Design a protein around this ligand. Sequence first.
Ligand SMILES: O=C(O)CCC(=O)C(=O)O
Ligand SMILES: [Cl-]
Ligand SMILES: [Mn+2]
Length: 214
Amino acid sequence: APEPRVIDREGVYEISLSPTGVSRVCLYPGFVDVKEADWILEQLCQDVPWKQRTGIREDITYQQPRLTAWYGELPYTYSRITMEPNPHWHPVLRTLKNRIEENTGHTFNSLLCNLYRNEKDSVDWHSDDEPSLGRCPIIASLSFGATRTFEMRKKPPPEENGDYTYVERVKIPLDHGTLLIMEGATQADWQHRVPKEYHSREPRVNLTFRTVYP
Ligand SMILES: O=C(O)CCC(=O)C(=O)O
Ligand SMILES: [Cl-]
Ligand SMILES: [Mn+2]
């Protein structure tokens, strides 16, 4: 089994060129300085209306191993009743939205907040390929609190018979205040997850900004 590549330096990485196109990730460690990130984490922990929700795999439901809240536009196929998106952005979240946009040149209209309570909270392998994100969505990820690992694995071609054993893999540590951008063919050609850990972890808040189209 090949060895996962590690991305942990500020930079811009074309992680693949095919089959759909160039998949690109950009890493910005310390996008938010630690002390400001400490204050932001406090605010979001006190104010975001975190709730336990269910997810779907294979038309069966389950309690997601994370708490969530939504702001702005919601992907068309999700349930507004279940996800309860707030069209009025928390002022702190609005600031971070504006700061990402001013520093990267990308716009967003949707925010998913994820609270990983501890080392047993996680998100399983997936792509951000909801239809209303379009082909090649630009997705910005901002992390606060405990470091957790963002893993990626390349979607195998058909001749691989659905085996992920030998696909290319990337590992990215996401620490306090780090911004990560995915763009290009990344949702098309890759999956990603945040795995559970077998060692004590304090809380982590992740902000995933996206653009939902009508
Ligand atoms: O928390 C992370 O960094 C990943 C979150 C994610 O993949 C999602 O919100 O769909
Ligand atoms: Cl999950
Ligand atoms: Mn995702």
